Amino acid sequence: SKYSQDVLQLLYKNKPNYISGQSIAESLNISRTAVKKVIDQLKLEGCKIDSVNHKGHLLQQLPDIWYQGIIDQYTKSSALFDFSEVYDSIDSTQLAAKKSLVGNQSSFFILSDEQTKGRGRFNRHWSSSKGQGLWMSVVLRPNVAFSMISKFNLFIALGIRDAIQHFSQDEVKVKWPNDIYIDNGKVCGFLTEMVANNDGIEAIICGIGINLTQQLENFDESIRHRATSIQLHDKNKLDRYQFLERLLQEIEKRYNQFLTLPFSEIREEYNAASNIWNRTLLFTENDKQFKGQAIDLDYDGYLIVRDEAGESHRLISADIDF
């Protein structure tokens, strides 16, 4: 109902204390009894809320759904993000951000429980099941030249990897320049885009797709042997809000790094985190297609590739399969 997010917001915020029906009713100027309906609704979509006589209500656990009212807390505390848009189902978080960034200078992100027209690179499909992943777009506003896009895409990768690492008991490796793996399982695809002209970047738009909670059973057979989810590498079980929280801080940490450090400062960390070395890779370029070894990452974010015919290459980007 109209007041569902507001009740949630107050519950989230009053932790770890209990808030009464009464007090919620005063805050929102509604009846005690409309407050009980709201709370019954929430209990039923899987909010876990302790209700105790004489004391009131305590939100204990959220379900696998994004709620505007909760993420408004994230945006208020945040120095980087002006606001967020939260959706149940949408064509694409990325399409939505590209439309919202027009005509303002705000930094925001967009989340949706499901995408019905999720896209990765080169217009491939990106599977985005309801309840099962974080499907997010982030818009930011760095004052920098349009060349700097590639360097952005390097910092953000270490951020995303760190946030996933904190939750899997197995190793999380980056696959340059746009994917994150646990073993042979791709767990995130991410993608960075921009609007810019000669005078600079107007917005960076970063599309982040992370498998959260899928069982192997839940991926389509075409990708099932090469896909995984954070839940499949977590002992204790995985909360999407706590996850989102860590993800946002990592992004901010990595973003200020991007603003303030040369790529040389994180390069070594990046090599060490990467799973492209000492192994044979498939490169695709508009037609041509070749095997190659990754040799190195140069001071400026180029992959040095020892091609297969022995010719060397310097790539600011590529697309690679194992």
Ligand X SMILES: Nc1ncnc2c1ncn2[C@@H]1O[C@H](COP(=O)(O)OC(=O)CCCC[C@@H]2SC[C@@H]3NC(=O)N[C@@H]32)[C@@H](O)[C@H]1O
Q: Which residues bind a copy of itself (CB under 8 A)?
A: 91-92, 95, 98-99, 102-103, 121-122, 146, 149-150, 153, 177, 191-199, 202, 316-317, 319
Find the shortest distance in angstroms from Cβ 238 to ligand X: 16
Alpha helices in 29-107 (DSSP H): 32-44, 68-77, 93-100
Among 211, 213, 274, 275, binds ligand X (CB under 6 A): 211
Cα angle 117, 195, 201; round to 5: 145
Could you tell me the sign of the dihedral formed by the alpha carbons of 283, 285, 287, 292, in that order? Answer: negative
Two tokens at 172? Answer: 């999380």
Binder to ligand X among 69, 189, 292, 301 (CB under 6 A)? 189
Decide: is 127 part of the binding site for ligand X (CB under 6 A). yes
Size of the chain, expressed as the number of residues it contains: 322
Contact call for residue 213 and ligand X (CB under 6 A): no
Q: Closest Cα to residue 177, out of 253, 279, 307, 283?
A: 283
The C-alpha atoms of residue 97 and residue 109 are separated, in whole angstroms, by: 7
Distance CA 95, CA 4 (A): 27
Structure tokens at 104: 């303002």
d(CA 198, CA 220): 42
Task: Report the nearest approach of a copy of itself to the CB of residue 76 (Å).
Answer: 28
Choose among 62, 114, 117, 63: nearest CA to 88: 114
222 Cβ contact partners less than 8 Å away, ≥ 6 residues apart: none
Dist. CA 135–CA 265, nearest whole Å: 30
Site string for ligand X, 223-242 (x = CB under 6 A): x---x---------------
Residue 149 binds which entry of ligand X, a copy of itself, none, with Cβ cut-offs from 5 to 8 Å by kind?
a copy of itself
100 binds ligand X (CB under 6 A): no
56 vs 207, which CB is nearer to ligand X?
207
Rounded to a whole number of angstroms, the minimum distance from the CB of residue 235 to ligand X is 22
Among 15, 55, 124, 314, binds ligand X (CB under 6 A): 124
Is 121 a binding residue for ligand X by CB under 6 A? The answer is yes
191 lines the binding site for ligand X (CB under 6 A): yes
Q: Quick one: which of 21, 56, 207, 301 contacts ligand X (CB under 6 A)?
A: 207
Q: Based on the shown chain and the rule CB under 6 A, indicate whether residue 109 belongs to the binding site for ligand X.
A: no
Among 93, 100, 153, 168, which residue sits at the site for ligand X (rule: CB under 6 A)? Answer: 93
Q: Which residues contact 299 (CB under 8 A, 6 or more apart)?
A: 262, 263, 264, 267
> Does 267 participate in binding ligand X (rule CB under 6 A)?
no
Q: Which residues bind ligand X (CB under 6 A)?
A: 92-94, 115, 118-121, 124, 126-128, 135-137, 178-179, 186, 189-191, 207-209, 211, 223, 227
